[model samples]
Target: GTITSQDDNVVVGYWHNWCDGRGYQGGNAPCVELKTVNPQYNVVNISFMKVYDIAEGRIPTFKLDPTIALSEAEFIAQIDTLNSQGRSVLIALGGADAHIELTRGDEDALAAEIIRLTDLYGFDGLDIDLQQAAITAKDNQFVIPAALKMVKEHYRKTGDNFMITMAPEFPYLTANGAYTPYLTELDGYYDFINPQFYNQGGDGLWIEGVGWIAQNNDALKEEFIYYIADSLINGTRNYHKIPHDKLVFGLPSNIDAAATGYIQDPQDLYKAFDRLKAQGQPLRGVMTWSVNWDMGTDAANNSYNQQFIKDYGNFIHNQLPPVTDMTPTLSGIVDTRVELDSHFDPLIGITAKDYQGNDITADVTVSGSVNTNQVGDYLLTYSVSSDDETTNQPRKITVYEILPAFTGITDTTVVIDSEFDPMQGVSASHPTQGDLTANITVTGEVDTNVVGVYELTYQLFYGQDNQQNMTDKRIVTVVTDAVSDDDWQVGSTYVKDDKVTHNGATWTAQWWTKGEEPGTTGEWGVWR
Candidate 1:
C-alpha cells in the first residue's frame, strides 16, 4: 500500500524494542542503532518499535520529544536519512510495549493520526504490530475487525492510498484463540500481514535449536525454511483466506543460533536468503527484529550486526523480486566475482519452484565466468534442457561487475570505509570481503602528527564454497607521525607516505577515521 518513493516495493525491517533496541540494556546511545548509518543502504520499510506499544491495555504513543526522546529522535533521523537516500520509513507502534492506546478500538483518532503522519512526515504506512493479541480479549472478540474498520474508514474518507498492515505470531494465525477473528477483521484494512515464524511457538531455532543447526547442512536448512513457510502461510490463510500477495513471511535477520544464541550478522541472514532462493521459494522478502541492538557493538552482539541494519534497506531491495508478478525458480544465488578474474568469490545457489512449492526439476546447466578482461558487466546463464519431457524449462543468471573495490586499488570493488569525505581523502583503498590488498590511498585533512599504524578493515557478508572468500579483507596505511614538515616541505620529500608514490600534489596518503569528515563514529576508518 506504499506509494513509490524510489520504487513500489516493500521488504520491511522491523526493529524490536527489547531484545535488539538496547532500550532494555543501559539505554546506551550507540549500542545498536540503525540511524547512525542508514544513508549508505537502500531500505523500504523501517519499523521503529516501542515493545508492548501494542500490548493489551496500553495506549500507543507516536510522538517523541526532540530533546528528551533522544532514542526516538535518533531512530527518526536514521529512517529520515534513508528516506532522503530514497527509502521509506514506517514507525512501528507495537512490539514488547503495550501501554500505548492505538487499539482502543477507536477509529476516529487512529485515522486522523495516520493522516497526520502521512501529511507531516510522508510515512509510507503504519504497521499494526499487536504482537500476538489474543482473540478473546475482554469484550473484544472483534479486535482485529474493529481495527480494520478504523483503518479502512480513514483511508476511504481521505482517499489516500496508505498502507495498513498487521503482525501475526508465526505459523498459527489462530494462536491463543483470538487470531482467527482478529485476522478476519484485519483482512479488510491491512494491505498485508507479516506473520513471524521465529522464536516462541514459531521457529525458536536460535534459542532452542543449536543441535538442529549443527546437524543440518545447506539442503536441510533449506527444507526447514520451506516447511516453516508452508506452515505459516497455510495457517494464516486457513480462516481469513488472505491472498499470498497480501502476506509477507516475517524473517528473523538475527536468529538465535543453536550454538551462538543470537547471530545478527547481515551476511548470515543473506545466507539464509540464499538457501531459500536456492530452493526456489516464492515468498516476499524478510522483516527484521528491533534495530539499534543489531546496529551496535556490544559483548552480546557482534559489530557486523549493526552493519546489516544499515545496509538492509538497499540490500533487501536488491534481493527481492518486484511486488508484481515474478519469475519462479527452484533455488539460486548469483556471484559474479569469478568472471572478472578480479579476485572475488563467485557463488550463489537459487532453487526454483511452482505455486505448489515443488522443484521445477529442469535439467539445469551453468555458463559464464568466461572472459576475464576489463571492468564491466558480465552474465552467468543457467539453462535447463527443454528437449526432455518432464519439465522442459530454461533460465539464465546475469552477474554485474563494477568499480574497483578500493580507491587507488584495482580488481576488488567496495571496501568498508567508516570515514569518507572529499577534500582530505575520498576513496578507500580496501576490500571488505576478499584477499586483503596492500594498496593504500588517503584523503581528508592530513594530520600527520595524529599517528599510528592506522588500520582500515572490511568484513565481507557473503557466502562461498571456499569459506575464505566470504570473509576476506584488505588494508591501507597512513603514517602521520612519519610525515615531517620538511617532507610536507619541498622536493626533499615530494615523497608522500612510504611504499606509495604520488604524481605531483595530485596524490597523498590518507585513511578513513571514525568521526572525521566523511567518517561516522562506527565504520572502517583510520585508527592512530
Candidate 2:
C-alpha cells in the first residue's frame, strides 16, 4: 500500500500596507489603493490593524483609525475582489510599537466588533500580529484567556466558519514575554499561527534569494541559507512547539543583500528551492512577507524567480504516491501511538503505511473518540484493506500534542536616546544611548521585584525599500528598586515620545522624529 502524497496546500502571503498598495507607510499612513493584483494567494495576512489615538494633533493613525481610515465596507470590497480571485483575507491586528490589547479590551465588545468587521469586510479569518509584544511589556496579560474563550465560543456557537490565529515574533527569543500562557487552552479554537523568522542574529527564512537552490553555487548557497536559515531553524527548533503538520512555513519573496547578507535576486530563491526538492525535504510552502515586492512586475525573469512555489508542489506530488490497493486482514487489536505538538492537547494522529512498506495509499476510514477540544493526546484508528492483506498496523491512533505559549519578556535593557542637530533629516553621526535605561515587565506570575539587573529592549520597524525593513534594537537596564528623581536624572533618562490625533485618527508622537528646536542668544542654536 502506498499513500498518495499530499498537495502543497499551504501557501501564505502577507499584505504589508507600507510595501504594497500604499506608497508611503511610516509617519503613520494608510493604504491608498483599494484593488490591484493580490488575490491568488491561499492566505493573505494584512499587517497593523490597531488604532492608537495620540494626544498630539500632528500624527495620524491613518488606515488604523476606525473613523477616517479605510472603512470595513471598503476593505470588504477588496475582500470580495480577492474572494473572486480565490484568495483568503485575514486582518493582522498588531504592528511594531503599536500596542493593541485585544485581551485587555471588553471581551464581548471586542469579539462582537471583530465579528462585525469580518462579516462586513468579507475577511475569512483574523491574524493576530502581536509583534509589538516583542519589544514591550503587555499592560494587561490576563485578558488572553477571556479573549480566547469569547472568540472560540462565538465561532463555535455562531458557526461563522472563520479562522482565528496569531503571528508572534520571529522566533522564541530570550526577550519576548508577551504571549499568553494558555495557548494550549486556545489551541482548540485557533486554526493556525506563524512566527516571523529572519534577521542578522540568525537565519534568512524571512528573506528571499536563489542560493537556496544552487548546489554548486556556494556563494548563492551560503547567501540563500543566510536568509532561509532563520526560517528553517525556527521551523526545525520550534516545530515541535506547534503542530508541525498544521503550520505553514514562511519565506520572503525579496532580499536586501546588504541587510541580511543576501544577493538581491529572486533567481537564487528558485535555485535553493530546487535543491530542497532534490533532497526530498518538501517544506509546507513558501510565504511572501508581501505580494508587492516579489510580483513579476518588479523583476525581469518571472518564471525562474517564482520557482520556490513550483518546487514546493513538485516535492509533494513527486514524493507522495497514492496506494490503489489496501486491505486490512487482521481484526487484531492495535493500540496506536500518535506524536503531536505540545500545544495540540486534543490531538489524534493517524499515520498508516501499507503492507508493502508504502504509506497508506488510500484515504482509509478514520474513526476515533478523543478530546478534540484541548491540546492533549487522543486515540484514532484506520481501517483499510487490499486484495488479500489488511493493515495489521494498529487501527488505533494516538496524538501527542505540544502548544507554543507567550511566556513573557525577559532581559529588558535600554540605551540612551540619541540627539540630532537637524531633527527632521538623517544625521551623519550614529547616536548611541549614553547610558542604559529600560524597564522589564515579566508576565506568567514571575516577580519583577527581585533585587537584580534586568534588560529592556525596543525595536523600530520601518521599511527601507520595496519589501525591505530595517529593525534596530535599543537595550537598557532595569533595576529592581526605583531610583529617586535626582539620581535617576543623572545616570540615564527616558524620553517620552509624544502622541498625536488628527483628522479623527490617532498615533504615537514619540515614534516620529522631532523637528528642529528654534532658539537664539548664547546657546549652541544661536551660535549655529
Candidate 3:
C-alpha cells in the first residue's frame, strides 16, 4: 500500500493478496484480513497488479490477486481502514511471476486503467515492481514513465499526493542500464527507489576509490549501500540522482523470502544505514519482499519476520538508549550485591536516562529481593520507562556453598620420555577453610612416555556434604618436540622454511604447502 513519511524513515513491506499462492507458512504468516497488517510496515504495496493479456482493440485491466480476489468494495473498505490507521496501501504492478508489456500507443490505456484501479481500490499510489523483461523490453522505458506520470498527475488534481515507489533489481541500475532511462526520465517524479538487494546472487559494487567488490559480506554490503546509494542520492557519473529521502535499500526479511542474498543478521544492514546517515546521506528506509513471506517460518519454525519488523521498526524509530551504570556502592560489579560477612545496599547511586538523554533515575523501578545469607543466586529486575520501549536491567547476587580457591597451581609442560612427577609444585587451598594441604586428595598420575596431556585433580572440602566443595586441576602436557620443531613428513603442514632437504632429489617446503608431492608442487614450492 501507499504511505508518505517526510520526517522519518518508512518501512515498506509488500502484502501478498494471494496468500495461498505465495504459500503462507504457520506462525506469524497465517493469511488474515487486510486491515490486520502490523503497523510497523508503514507502507504496504499490494502485490501484484499484472496486465491482462488481450487481443487487438482490447484495453489492459486490473484485478486484486485473482485466486483470492475480494470484492472491489471489500478492497476499498480495507484500504480506507488502512488509511485511517496511518498505514498506506498501493497497487504494486508486475512481479517476478507476473508479466507486463506495452506497445507504442498503450500508455493511454494503461494509464487510464491505473487511475481506475486507484479509484476503485482506494489506493494512495502505485508501486512499480517491473522486473527484468517488463523493464528491459522495448517501449516500457517510454510507456511506463508516461503512464506513471499520468497517474501521478491525476492524483495531484485531487488533494492527495500519490506516492510512487520503484522496486528494481540492483544490476539494472548501473550507470547505463535498462532502468537508467526510466529512472532518469522519472527523476524527481518518483518518491523513492527500493533496490531489491535480495535474489541478486553475489551481485556487488565497483566504486571510484574502491575497486570491484563481488561478495555480499557485511563490510562490502555496507560499502555497496554507501557508494551505490550515495550515487543515487547525490548525482553519480551520468546516473539519475534523487533526494536523500528518495532512496530505500531493499532486503529479504527471511531467508525464504528470496533465493539468495539473505542477510542472516539484519544488524549489519542497520549498521550500513548508520554509515549512510553518518555520511549525511540518510536513506528513506528499508523494503522487504512480502509481508506473507516475512511472516513465514525460520529454521526453528518461529516467526523470523517478526524479528525483521521489530528490528526495522526499532532501527527506523530508534530504540530507547540502554540504561547507564552509576555506582558500584554494593558489590564489585555495578548494581550488584555480594556479602561475605558484610552489609550492602543495592539502591545506592543507581541511575539512568532515556534515549533523549533526559535523566529518568526517579522513574526507575526495582523488583525482586537479594539475600546473601541464603547462599544462592538471586536476581533483581530493574525497569525504567522510555519513549518507545521499557528497558529492564538485571542485578544478580551470587553466593556459594562449597567454595574452593588455589593460591599457586597452573598447567605445566614436559618433554616426551623426560622425568616427570604429577605432584611437583602442586598445592591446593579453599575459601573458608585454608591450609588444606593435609586434607587435600590428589587423583590421576603423569606418564612421561605418553605424548599427550595428563590431568591431575586436587580436591578439598569444607563440610560432610560433597556439594559444598571445590576442586582444582593442573594439566601436564607431554609433547614430542619441546622446541616447536618437527621433521618433514607426508601430510604434514609446512609454512615457509618450515622443513628442509630430503636429500638431493626431494626437498622440504619453502612456501606454504600442505604435503604436495615433490614433482607436483608449483613454482613457489621448494620441494622437488
Predicted model with the maximum TM-score: 3
Score residue 63 of candidate 3 by CA lDDT. Answer: 60
Model 1: per-residue lDDT, tens digit, 309-364?
45456655564553332223323444334433344333345444433323554445
> Per lDDT, what order, best first?
3, 1, 2
State the weakest 10-residue window (summed lDDT) of model 2: 428-437
Against the true structure, what is each candidate's TM-score? 0.45, 0.43, 0.55
Q: Stretches of candidate 1 above 4 Å error?
A: 1-9, 15-59, 65-81, 99-105, 132-136, 139-148, 156-159, 174-177, 201-220, 234-243, 255-281, 300-302, 305-316, 319-528
After superposition on all CA atoms, what RMSD does each candidate show versus the true structure? Answer: 30.5, 27.9, 26.2
Better of 1 and 2 by lDDT: 1
lDDT of 1 at 122: 53
lDDT by candidate, in order shown: 0.43, 0.42, 0.67
Instruction: Encode model 2's per-residue lDDT on 1-528: one tens digit a residue.
Output: 110112234456666565323211111122334365333356677765665554532111225334425566676676677666556677776665676543345555656666666655666666666554532334234454455467656665755546665655444422223453433335445555555543333432323333223312335554443334333423342222333233444544434211232234545545554454455433344455554443422223232234334434344334332222223222224464444322332123444444333445354565666543333545555566655665433343455433221112233432223221211222111122111112111122212334334333322222212132222222224343443222111123224443333233333323223342212212433111
By TM-score, highest first, what's the ranking? 3, 1, 2
